[PDB]
From a paper:
The [name] [name], a signal recognition particle ([name])-type enzyme, is pivotal for spatial–numerical control and bacterial flagella assembly across diverse species, including pathogens. [name], together with SRP54 (or Ffh) and FtsY, belongs to an evolutionarily conserved protein family with only three members: the signal recognition particle ([name]) GTPases. The three [name] GTPases share a conserved NG domain, with the N domain comprising an α-helical bundle and the G domain being a [name] with an α–β–α insertion termed the I-box. The [name] activity of the [name] homodimer and its dissociation into a GDP-bound monomer is stimulated by the protein FlhG, which serves as numerical regulator of flagella biosynthesis.
In this report, we present the biochemical and structural analysis of a GDP-bound monomer of [name] from the polar-flagellated bacterium [name] CN32. Expression of NG-[name] yielded approximately 40 mg per litre of culture (equivalent to 8 g of cells) and protein purification followed standard protocols described previously. Analytical size-exclusion chromatography (SEC) revealed the presence of a monomer. Amino-acid residues 183–437 of NG-[name] could be unambiguously assigned into the electron-density map and represent almost all of the residues of the protein construct employed in this study. The structure of NG-[name] reveals that of a classical NG domain of the [name]-[name] family. The GDP is coordinated by residues of the G1, G4 and G5 elements, which are conserved among the [name] [name] family. In the GDP-bound state of [name], the guanine base of the nucleotide is coordinated by Asp388 and Glu389 of the G4 element. The α- and β-phosphates of GDP are coordinated by Lys254, Thr255 and Thr256 of the G1 element. Density for a magnesium ion was not present within the active site of NG-[name]. Most prominently, Arg283 within the G2 loop is properly ordered in our structure, coordinating the β-phosphate of the GDP. The binding of GDP introduces a rotation of 20–40° of the helices of the bundle in relation to its center.
Residue numbers in the entry:
A (entry chain A), B (entry chain A): 183 to 437
Write the structure that this text describes.
């Protein structure tokens, strides 16, 4: 298969994962060279499986989980404001389960003042369950978990709490930085998938050289790409993932 | 060159950079297969050019610079305690030039209470120059800069301040996470080298799959590897870089 082999080779060189590089290489068997120009991005975008801004339209209890310094707190704040700009701040509340960082409550509490929404800290499961029922009238409750290394033995503590009691449904979104090595991102995914994840938030596109590995990991892991962030400005440096745009960007190396 | 080619190929597969992979491949021309077992790690360790714990023995004004969430504040605190455990806390002082983060002073100020050392915030250059002369009797002054994306247009602001006035010498150390893609780390290096750097701090070895790319970037950029961090525990999760150990770890893929 002459064309299939060149495509795959180039896709690997452009930092796509072996699995995705093959799947994309494969459509050279169903398309014209010319059709392929549009078919490559379109297939990649499709695979990334974006679900609009589900947080905003759907609400509910949403938790951000992920390894250290990826931007969970920053992306949480962006989401809060987003939801509040439609709807209203009286409909948003914030929780942190991070009793590690030097005064995590204070950072998040300060965002609360800025954005006009209550902020509570859960020290354990019982308290989290109280706070969530207490906030039942809120349309969006955002939970900020503690950043930990994906192989940290404490990890399950932060994670299993979000999936305990089958009558508080919680949608957990994995926050990953697009700067990470492909294998690190995959390692993170594998360990964090200890609980069901509803999608991924991809941060630091403004620091990234290439999105190919990051996008590949999401494809491979069957994680929808929900939102992207591209700077430090709260709240505007967040977008609903436009997967076609992202696909195009990632494939521009080949061109 | 049969052996040279296989070595390079394997080294590339183990995620070493083209430049370093070639240099290491090259010593198969000067060593026995058996001598090579020890010569590979030894050459790689040599290239990483560690300078003991220079901060501790030497002191002076030390600044940590680097992109977002890499662990500048956390590594600063570790260094402070290290210096204080030898010598004393009355010999250490802390400065932050980060007037961006929601109350950066408070985090660092809280470490100050913990570790028994004064903490000041510089809002501009003049104030930094005052604070440093004010702290002239301190043997170590540690400066925590604001984390920014390596291509952030504000970057020079944080950086040029550390190199203004040729009568306050400051040693800047680049803090980089070992989780980052090789090309991102290199991109970071290139932009941060807008000022002279004295070395690198390599963080999050406990989150890393492989050190090969990270080590390669330091080699290529001629940046000494000063310290490594391998967890979130302040202050003990920091070591002087044992380059031979690191070299061995990075090369164990080939085995
Ligand atoms: N350049 C860039 N920096 C970001 C982005 N998101 C977060 N950051 C920074 O990454 C650092 C970590 O932010 P934080 O929300 O506390 O990460 P967390 O520890 O997971 O909660 C901070 O310096 C943020 O400003 C992004 O999209 N682009
Ligand atoms: N697993 C691991 N996490 C680290 C390490 N160093 C810092 N972190 C975490 O990375 C996050 C960023 O810490 P911080 O010092 O504020 O990074 P900064 O924004 O550059 O100052 C925090 O959650 C730290 O706990 C490390 O060596 N290993």
């Amino acid at each position: 298969d002459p064309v299939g082999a060149m495509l795959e080779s180039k896709l690997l060189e452009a930092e796509f994962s072996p699995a995705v590089a093959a799947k994309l290489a494969a459509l050279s068997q169903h398309y014209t060279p010319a059709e392929l120009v549009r078919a490559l991005p379109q297939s990649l975008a499709n695979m990334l499986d974006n679900q609009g801004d589900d947080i905003v339209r759907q609400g509910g209890v949403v938790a951000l989980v992920g390894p250290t310094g990826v931007g969970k707190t920053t992306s949480l704040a962006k989401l809060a404001a987003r939801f509040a700009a439609h709807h209203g701040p009286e409909q948003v509340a914030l929780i942190t389960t991070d009793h590690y960082r030097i005064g995590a409550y204070e950072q998040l509490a300060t965002y609360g003042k800025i954005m006009g929404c209550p902020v509570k800290q859960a020290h354990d499961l019982n308290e989290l369950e109280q706070i969530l029922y207490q906030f039942r009238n809120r349309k969006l409750v955002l939970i900020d978990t503690a950043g930990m290394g994906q192989r940290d033995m404490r990890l399950y503590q932060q994670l299993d709490n979000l999936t305990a009691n089958s009558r508080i449904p919680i949608r957990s979104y994995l926050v990953l930085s697009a700067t990470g090595q492909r294998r690190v991102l995959q390692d993170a995914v594998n360990h964090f998938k200890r609980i069901p994840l509803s999608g991924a938030v991809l941060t630091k596109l403004d620091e990234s050289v290439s999105l190919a590995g990051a996008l590949s990991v999401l494809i491979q892991s069957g994680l929808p790409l929900s939102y992207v962030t591209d700077g430090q400005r709260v709240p505007e440096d967040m977008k609903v993932a436009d997967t076609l745009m992202l696909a195009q960007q990632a494939l521009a190396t080949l061109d």
